[PDB]
Paper text:
Whereas previous studies on salivary gland extracts from the sandfly [name] identified [name] (salivary anticomplement from L. longipalpis) as a potent inhibitor of the classical complement pathway (CP), its precise mechanism of action has remained elusive. We found that [name] inhibits the CP by binding specifically to the zymogen form of [name]. We provide two crystal structure determinations and supporting functional studies which show that [name] binds tightly to the zymogen activation loop of [name] preventing cleavage of its scissile bond. However, since the [name] zymogen undergoes autoactivation over time, we expressed an engineered fragment of human [name] consisting of its two CCP repeats and its serine protease domain, wherein the catalytic serine (S654) had been mutated to alanine (zC1r-12SP).
Residue numbers in the entry:
A (entry chain C): 308 to 417, 420 to 508, 515 to 597, 605 to 628, 630 to 703
B (entry chain A): 24 to 112
The structure:
Amino acid sequence: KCPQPKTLDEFTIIQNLQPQYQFRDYFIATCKQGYQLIEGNQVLHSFTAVCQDDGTWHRAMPRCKIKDCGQPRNLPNGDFRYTTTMGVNTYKARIQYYCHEPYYKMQTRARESEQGVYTCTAQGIWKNEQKGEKIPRCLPVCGKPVNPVEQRQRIIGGQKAKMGNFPWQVFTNIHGRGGGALLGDRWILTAAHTLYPKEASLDVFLGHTNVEELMKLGNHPIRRVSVHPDYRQDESYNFEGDIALLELENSVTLGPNLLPICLPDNDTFYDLGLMGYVSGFGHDLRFVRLPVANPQACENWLRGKNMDVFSQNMFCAGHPSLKQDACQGDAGGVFAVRDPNTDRWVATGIVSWGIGCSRGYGFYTKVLNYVDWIKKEMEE
Amino acid sequence: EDCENIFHDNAYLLKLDCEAGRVDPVEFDDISDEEIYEITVDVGVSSEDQEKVAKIIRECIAQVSTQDCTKFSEIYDCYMKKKICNYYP
């Protein structure tokens, strides 16, 4: 005979409590949901005790302490808050994930509010109703700059760009001074002739309006460089397919000084008369607004002077009566137009071939026809 | 010559927006002394020349009575006849 096994706490379950235990006989001890065997400070997967000759069990009764899911996983570009008792990771504890708005945005599924609610389940892992152990995903917003340019334009115009007006503008110094825009937190959109000129150390800078500061803000190395196959480096007259993407070695942490730019979705952004900003450098970032011109009035002006390659994948912007220079934009930079409905900034064009860098119209690369190619290289 | 051409281009972009129906002409006649301060100090005027540029702005907004899309031209000419760009870099 040996004593009736009594539990130390309350969460312990004695499987099949036999009225008395003789020699050779045994019992086992399990826990309830969300509880585990301990014995001191260890963690047991199972407990058994035999009735060892005299009235003793060969190992003392364990205790079922509460399971601890541990410190929740860090949400990239996001964070979380405890909805239950703060700092408690034990069973029946819940947390609320959230992304660093307005820079990143948690992906939805249609489904909200309860989207970033993870709880400490009985298996010791943070799960959810919809979706199991996988954590949410903070996605960057394309347009929506923190400090958008003023829409009330004045005759007393200030052509100096401030911090946040163009958070997507980047600076490249490959074969010469250049630039482009940001797509997401990893991809750079620019023109192909800044990579393969018609006549390489890459060097990509971004995140500020001062040229001296952009270089102080560190370099951004590149992995793959996808140039559109329609671009011919040797043909020093045709910039067909003047578009390319640049994948950064590491993703960037977005902020008010650094945000992506949206891609065009419908062709209404190319209607005649739409106004678009182009930003560029010299020693500081300047911006000018230019109207998209008649695609036919630009060809008559073009052929009327001397033959170029105005195609449907291209469009022209500017006006002759303007006193600015035709080379007022910056090479590889994007033709930034804002949708007055959704108040987002789309990159409808890319600074490509500007004939006669003195005065007249300016030609760009129509991004809309190349969006499907851009989404292909990025998703890979 | 930079200031002159830049103001010409801004006024003519405003005239294009007027022709498209994106900007009301009467709205351009409304600017506060605070907004004039901001626009003049951001582009870099002398703090002493601030009130003089403001006088020029008010006098040129008043001199024009044509509330059509051409006012942006006329006001500009006034800005050039009052020599506003001598106050600007």
